[PDB]
Amino acid sequence: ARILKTAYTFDDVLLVPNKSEVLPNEVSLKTQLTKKIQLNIPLMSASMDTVTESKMAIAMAREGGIGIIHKNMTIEDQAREVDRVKRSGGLLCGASIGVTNDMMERVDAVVKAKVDVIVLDTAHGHSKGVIEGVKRIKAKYPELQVIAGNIATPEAVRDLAEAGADCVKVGIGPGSICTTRIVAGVGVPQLTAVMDCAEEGKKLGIPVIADGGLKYSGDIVKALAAGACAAMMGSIFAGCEEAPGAIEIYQGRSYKVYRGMGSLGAMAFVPEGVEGRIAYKGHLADTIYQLIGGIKSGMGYLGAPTLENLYENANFVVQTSAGFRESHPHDINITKEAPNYS
Amino acid sequence: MARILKTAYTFDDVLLVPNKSEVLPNEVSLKTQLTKKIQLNIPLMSASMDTVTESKMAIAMAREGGIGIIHKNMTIEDQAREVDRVKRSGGLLCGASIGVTNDMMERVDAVVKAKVDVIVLDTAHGHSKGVIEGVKRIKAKYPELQVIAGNIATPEAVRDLAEAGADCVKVGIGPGSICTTRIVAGVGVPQLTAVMDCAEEGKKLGIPVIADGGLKYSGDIVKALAAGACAAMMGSIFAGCEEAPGAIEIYQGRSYKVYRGMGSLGAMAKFVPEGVEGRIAYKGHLADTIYQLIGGIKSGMGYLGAPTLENLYENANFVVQTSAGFRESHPHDINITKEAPNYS
Amino acid sequence: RILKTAYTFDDVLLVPNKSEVLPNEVSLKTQLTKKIQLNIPLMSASMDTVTESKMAIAMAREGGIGIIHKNMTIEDQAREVDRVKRSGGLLCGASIGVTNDMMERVDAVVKAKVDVIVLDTAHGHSKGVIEGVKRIKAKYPELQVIAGNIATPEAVRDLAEAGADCVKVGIGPGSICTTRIVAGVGVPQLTAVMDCAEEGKKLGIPVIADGGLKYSGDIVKALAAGACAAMMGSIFAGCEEAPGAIEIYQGRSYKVYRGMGSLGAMAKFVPEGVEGRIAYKGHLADTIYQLIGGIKSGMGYLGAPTLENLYENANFVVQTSAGFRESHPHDINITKEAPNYSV
Amino acid sequence: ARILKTAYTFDDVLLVPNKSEVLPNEVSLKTQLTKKIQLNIPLMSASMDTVTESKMAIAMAREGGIGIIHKNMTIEDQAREVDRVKRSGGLLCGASIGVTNDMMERVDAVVKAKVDVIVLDTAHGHSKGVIEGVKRIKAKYPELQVIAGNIATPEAVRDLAEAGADCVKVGIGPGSICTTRIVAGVGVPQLTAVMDCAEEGKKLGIPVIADGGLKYSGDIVKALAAGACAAMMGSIFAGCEEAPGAIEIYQGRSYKVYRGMGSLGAMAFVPEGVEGRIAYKGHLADTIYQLIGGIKSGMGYLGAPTLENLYENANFVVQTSAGFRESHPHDINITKEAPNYS
Ligand SMILES: C[C@@H](Oc1cc[n+]([O-])c2ccccc12)c1cn(-c2ccc(Cl)cc2)nn1
Ligand SMILES: C[C@@H](Oc1cc[n+]([O-])c2ccccc12)c1cn(-c2ccc(Cl)cc2)nn1
Ligand SMILES: C[C@@H](Oc1cc[n+]([O-])c2ccccc12)c1cn(-c2ccc(Cl)cc2)nn1
Numbered sequence A, D: 001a002r003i004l005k006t007a008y009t010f011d012d013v014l015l016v017p018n019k020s021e022v023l024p025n026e027v028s029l030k031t032q033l034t035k036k037i038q039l040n041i042p043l044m045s046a047s048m049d050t051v052t053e054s055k056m057a058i059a060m061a062r063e064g065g066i067g068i069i070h071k072n073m074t075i076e077d078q079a080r081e082v083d084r085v086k087r088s089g090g091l092l093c094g095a096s097i098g099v100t101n102d103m104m105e106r107v108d109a110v111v112k113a114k115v116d117v118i119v120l121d122t123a124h125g126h127s128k129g130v131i132e133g134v135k136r137i138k139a140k141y142p143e144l145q146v147i148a149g150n151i152a153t154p155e156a157v158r159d160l161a162e163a164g165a166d167c168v169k170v171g172i173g174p175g176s177i178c179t180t181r182i183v184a185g186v187g188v189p190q191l192t193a194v195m196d197c198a199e200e201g202k203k204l205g206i207p208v209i210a211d212g213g214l215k216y217s218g219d220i221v222k223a224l225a226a227g228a229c230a231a232m233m234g235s236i237f238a239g240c241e242e243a244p245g246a247i248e249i250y251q252g253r254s255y256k257v258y259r260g261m262g263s264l265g266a267m268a269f270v271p272e273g274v275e276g277r278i279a280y281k282g283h284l285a286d287t288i289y290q291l292i293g294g295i296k297s298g299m300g301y302l303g304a305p306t307l308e309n310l311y312e313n314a315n316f317v318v319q320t321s322a323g324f325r326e327s328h329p330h331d332i333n334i335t336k337e338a339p340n341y342s
Numbered sequence B: 001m002a003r004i005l006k007t008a009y010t011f012d013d014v015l016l017v018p019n020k021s022e023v024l025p026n027e028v029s030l031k032t033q034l035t036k037k038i039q040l041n042i043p044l045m046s047a048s049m050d051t052v053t054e055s056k057m058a059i060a061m062a063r064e065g066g067i068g069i070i071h072k073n074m075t076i077e078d079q080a081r082e083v084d085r086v087k088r089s090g091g092l093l094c095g096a097s098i099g100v101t102n103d104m105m106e107r108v109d110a111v112v113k114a115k116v117d118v119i120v121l122d123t124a125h126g127h128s129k130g131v132i133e134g135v136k137r138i139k140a141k142y143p144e145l146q147v148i149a150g151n152i153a154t155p156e157a158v159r160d161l162a163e164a165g166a167d168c169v170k171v172g173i174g175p176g177s178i179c180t181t182r183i184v185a186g187v188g189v190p191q192l193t194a195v196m197d198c199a200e201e202g203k204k205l206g207i208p209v210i211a212d213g214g215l216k217y218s219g220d221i222v223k224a225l226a227a228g229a230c231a232a233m234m235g236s237i238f239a240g241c242e243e244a245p246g247a248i249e250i251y252q253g254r255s256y257k258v259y260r261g262m263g264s265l266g267a268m269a270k271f272v273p274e275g276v277e278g279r280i281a282y283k284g285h286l287a288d289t290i291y292q293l294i295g296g297i298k299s300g301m302g303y304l305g306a307p308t309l310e311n312l313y314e315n316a317n318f319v320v321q322t323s324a325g326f327r328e329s330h331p332h333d334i335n336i337t338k339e340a341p342n343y344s
Numbered sequence C: 001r002i003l004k005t006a007y008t009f010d011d012v013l014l015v016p017n018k019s020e021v022l023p024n025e026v027s028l029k030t031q032l033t034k035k036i037q038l039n040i041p042l043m044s045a046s047m048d049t050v051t052e053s054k055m056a057i058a059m060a061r062e063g064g065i066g067i068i069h070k071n072m073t074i075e076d077q078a079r080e081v082d083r084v085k086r087s088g089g090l091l092c093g094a095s096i097g098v099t100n101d102m103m104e105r106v107d108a109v110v111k112a113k114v115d116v117i118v119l120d121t122a123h124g125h126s127k128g129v130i131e132g133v134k135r136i137k138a139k140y141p142e143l144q145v146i147a148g149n150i151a152t153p154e155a156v157r158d159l160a161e162a163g164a165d166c167v168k169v170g171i172g173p174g175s176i177c178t179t180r181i182v183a184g185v186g187v188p189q190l191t192a193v194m195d196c197a198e199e200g201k202k203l204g205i206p207v208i209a210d211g212g213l214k215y216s217g218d219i220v221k222a223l224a225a226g227a228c229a230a231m232m233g234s235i236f237a238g239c240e241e242a243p244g245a246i247e248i249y250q251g252r253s254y255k256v257y258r259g260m261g262s263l264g265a266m267a268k269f270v271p272e273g274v275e276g277r278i279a280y281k282g283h284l285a286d287t288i289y290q291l292i293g294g295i296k297s298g299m300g301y302l303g304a305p306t307l308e309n310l311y312e313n314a315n316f317v318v319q320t321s322a323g324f325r326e327s328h329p330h331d332i333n334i335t336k337e338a339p340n341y342s343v
């Protein structure tokens, strides 16, 4: 037992403005998901059964990003959804794999469906199972892009890079539907965990991904400046028409079902997630336009023409509970709906 | 002079950091040494309050691998009969509460004859003369008897109680969900920091520590254990269970059980109170509640790559979280529409 | 030019000590000044909604002392003081403003046999207070004078040299205060009392903790911080011995309570206080019984037979906002009302 | 990517009372807006469309400070507003200029109408556009007084001072209607933001304007004690009757529309501000009277007869959230309304 440090999340921190020569319209958002794979926008959608299936992956890829088809469907149906995505336009497609007995069975299936990236995700990425699971997959298909998750420590990044992972997913406990930190007392405040594993990722030359904890466009900006190659989201996308689950109406307003993959309903081990509903946002292209527009804005403040240039010249400052109340709209009664704020 | 020492944390303040794991949750073991003789299977205890643990809860707790401490608010006669009812119920572990009183020996006499397994000498201020001389007096008449002394919050207290002959120390001044000691007396050390300190001084003297109070989740236990505690004691968590002495009241179709502190006005009426009196939601049976606690503990231990509790304490690293992180930890920005068995 | 982080009572917690003494074995005798002794270290605020004759008579019997407010006629204040004094040798205090007729107001209450005088202005570390205390101690060398309010140990020196026998500490910690908000000035009360007490010990002058004391536990902290006595208005404001008839609002009972720098009380300066209602606490004796019990309990925890030993042995600990949540009752719907804890 | 330090705001700190030979009435609140322009009170109405126009500018100047006519109108109309203020008894007047294609000819027109001060306010003053812009204005009108903003860092003060700016506006994200820190992640908590810029402005000889995040009169004192020469408020003034817009009744209570210059309404796209309604203050003169009462009283505590004596001898102290709770009134049911607290 030893208390090492104080760790921070996104709303603990703020990016200090830099001398700018670029405006939000000239900066680029292209990023390298892995060595082979690059994205025109650094956004991914979460490998969950209430966020991403065929229709969502196609939309995300059509916006320059990429989606990860979840793993709560039968093997036959998983390669089939991958098939639908790759067929229409030859877009980027991701498949979620679990450390199971029929692991190589799915991996063999979606590889046949010409998937771009296998991402195997678990609750505990720094484990004996996932490591050898990566080696097993990477042995059969050496050129296949593997993304392993989830971890929260730089030591974990080392062993996954050693195992053969071409990318890493960072974040234990920061999910909006997550209860891991509550029912297991385990996790690292996302921001600290990200820049800890991102810096360790730069040294070995592997990209890391921030997963969960993002509410606004400004949080993604902080994640990127912390060294993250991309950001994966669930709640921001779950209320979009391209997301699975029908529309439910309660008290006049429209909703979509959203739940963790470790909640009681999804696993149909004690639950490490909850189930609820999220506000229906409309079409994805309208949400992404705001997210992209917000990122370009922040990078313009920090005078970064590229995402590489952002990580190098970004400085963080820590705010308190007082500073956090100042950072949000205050002392006014909001009467008109903003497209990027509550 | 008045000295400001340091910042002290609780369980909501901190987070454990995932280690490399060769271990799955369904594989770890939660065995512990409550004392040198007594070895619990699961590291859970039930509080010795009149709204948590009578013979019913004690039998249920012992059956699940834990232990129950029968409260002392009843008569010496009525308590010995309670302890007995647990002991002759199938070789189960049982404990009884005592206080620094005049009939302290008469009560210890009664429960020792009821073949009680452990003795809990729990008071408001465990680091006092009355508790120290009390333990020495009990031990003088009953050497082989196992004694737990409380409540403490300092390493200095551990040494004095260990010097007196305590077999285990109970740590916690103010973490109680029904407690108002920190509010009316201004005295108390935030539980996590207090647990760590007493654990450390406890290891060196070869005497285990009990984490009492401040826990409302499974993660709180994982932090309590990783901080060097052998067992965690809970009242609020088990008070909602059907094996609790409280009767099932109903408010607006929802069912509740009454829960009060032993220093609350009602509990003392049997006045300057250091506790409050209220009601909590009815949970159901204990074994269903415990099954959720163990599943959370075993899940957390799988994260720190610990097969045993001793391996957890040795290989545990804590990270301090801000309030901003605390909000991120709990499920946020979602209207939860289905009740989870282990979160509310 | 940011010095440090300063704490209030809620930021801090007292660490238990080895104790060979029980809560009812401890003594609350204290030293208000060199010559004035209190059986309990509690004083009632000199406000128009808190302390007049009836309150001061009640505080004195219970062991403490009451300070009659100066928001009235010089004749009246001496009339109030006389009522308290002739009631059987009870300690009585009279607050004095720093005004043109400062002395004339004083002369009246020393004739009515007042025991202590307090010179309370919004800023006790100024020219008026300092030369004021000297003007008073010149005519009355034997009269016990309390000056305030201050928040710096530098101000303790300035007032101790002036001739003040005691200093009152607290800038903007009051329940009705807005000084920290409208002026931006003030020092968190635990830090303020700790600093001024230490410098007070070096000079041999008692300090008074004034404002921001919601609970009996807060009093234990201030006493452990070095304060000779605590002063509160919010606590005693609802009591029946306090000025003001009972207002019935929404079926419940209240008394009016307001700052002396509020628009209501000051009837050119901008308001530095608010005006409000506080629940009717019944009689005074009930409330102080709880307070004394809370103080006596905390001293039992810290192994303190006297208030002196308390200060010498006190260890403090800073708690985060998370510890503050587990300090108060949590995870329970409280039904029965606590006579010493409320929400 | 590294964390710099803890940046505080006004709710984070407290001023410590010094010895005082001066009563609040005996203090002077005069300042230097630039080296050439002086104010009798360090107050300044914000340059937004819903707070300051000719009615407000005259009202502000009549009370002691300046009002700055917003730039959300035609060049002709703005030159006429400046005209309405100047001919109205030779009062101090401020126009507002942005980095735009018609920027120069706009500056030409307001200079013609004898505007006393130009403010070049953009979302990001530490940029190529603003630096080049200030260069041009001083080139054409060497003696014209120009303020530039907004900034948050010392380096930006130097860069603006180098370009000939007579004064700089400090504040990235502290506004009451602001959503910049939320959408971009960019910002510096106003107190240390002002303090660091003020310290470096006093090394060069350039004043700084504490902008935004000022709720109370005490917050203005803290700003002045940190080194700021003047404070700028929109939220405090948008509710007065001299402000633009008609009064609104919602609950039988009077309100006025307050919107950010980067909100959907003001722009006519990605917004950086919100729109809403503020409570109706009434007449500005009675509002200013309360703010002057707070500043002079705060200086009375600090024994400051002047604003420079204030800065020279001002010690700050950080309070926690427990201290913040103690600062505001507590445990009381406020029956009657105070003029300076709500
Ligand atoms: C209950 C369920 O929870 C989850 C199920 C699925 N996902 O993706 C999860 C992600 C993060 C946290 C928990 C998740 C689950 C948890 N575990 C699990 C728990 C602990 C460990 Cl060490 C290894 C695996 N295996 N299944
Ligand atoms: C959305 C809008 O925001 C604003 C528009 C106008 N004003 O005056 C603003 C003042 C403070 C903060 C934001 C403001 C706006 C922002 N930007 C903008 C933002 C960043 C950069 Cl690097 C360059 C330009 N261009 N227009
Ligand atoms: C008010 C009541 O509170 C309690 C009464 C009974 N028990 O078991 C308690 C346990 C923990 C905390 C408080 C308890 C009580 C407190 N004390 C007490 C308080 C301080 C000291 Cl030093 C010694 C005894 N004596 N009775």
Ligand SMILES: C[C@@H](Oc1cc[n+]([O-])c2ccccc12)c1cn(-c2ccc(Cl)cc2)nn1
Pocket: C120, C121, C122, C123, C260, C261, C262, C269, C270, C271, C272, C273, D020, D022, D023, D024, D297, D298, D299, D300, D301
């Ligand atoms: C508004 C009113 O406030 C008060 C007026 C009267 N009293 O006794 C007060 C006591 C404590 C706090 C404020 C008080 C008041 C404040 N001041 C005042 C303010 C600042 C200074 Cl430096 C000196 C005096 N003059 N009148």
Ligand SMILES: O=c1[nH]cnc2c1ncn2[C@@H]1O[C@H](COP(=O)(O)O)[C@@H](O)[C@H]1O
Pocket: A046, A047, A048, A150, A171, A173, A174, A175, A176, A177, A178, A179, A180, A211, A212, A213, A214, A232, A233, A234, A235, A236, A259, A260, A261, A262, A263, A272, A273, A274
């Ligand atoms: O059942 C769960 N428990 C904990 N974390 C989960 C669960 N399901 C998904 N997650 C994680 O949470 C992320 C989404 O979080 P959000 O975008 O903040 O809503 C996913 O991409 C996963 O990494």
Ligand SMILES: O=c1[nH]cnc2c1ncn2[C@@H]1O[C@H](COP(=O)(O)O)[C@@H](O)[C@H]1O
Pocket: B047, B048, B049, B172, B174, B175, B176, B177, B178, B179, B180, B181, B212, B213, B214, B215, B233, B234, B235, B236, B237, B260, B261, B262, B263, B264, B274, B275, B276
């Ligand atoms: O009246 C009281 N005052 C203070 N602490 C109490 C009182 N009654 C019980 N406790 C403690 O609070 C613990 C229960 O903690 P909980 O699980 O948070 O309710 C018990 O095991 C006791 O140690």
Ligand SMILES: O=c1[nH]cnc2c1ncn2[C@@H]1O[C@H](COP(=O)(O)O)[C@@H](O)[C@H]1O
Pocket: C045, C046, C047, C170, C172, C173, C174, C175, C176, C177, C178, C179, C210, C211, C212, C213, C231, C232, C233, C234, C235, C258, C259, C260, C261, C262, C272, C273, C274
């Ligand atoms: O109008 C005021 N402004 C600021 N402080 C005040 C005012 N009136 C009284 N006080 C102080 O507040 C103390 C009581 O504070 P409370 O006990 O927290 O209500 C009094 O003893 C005075 O020192």
Ligand SMILES: O=c1[nH]cnc2c1ncn2[C@@H]1O[C@H](COP(=O)(O)O)[C@@H](O)[C@H]1O
Pocket: D046, D047, D048, D150, D171, D173, D174, D175, D176, D177, D178, D179, D180, D211, D212, D213, D214, D232, D233, D234, D235, D236, D259, D260, D261, D262, D263, D272, D273, D274
């Ligand atoms: O759309 C906007 N976004 C962010 N800040 C703004 C916007 N419009 C005006 N501001 C700034 O916010 C300040 C007002 O702060 P307030 O008094 O706290 O409302 C103005 O002086 C501007 O400098």
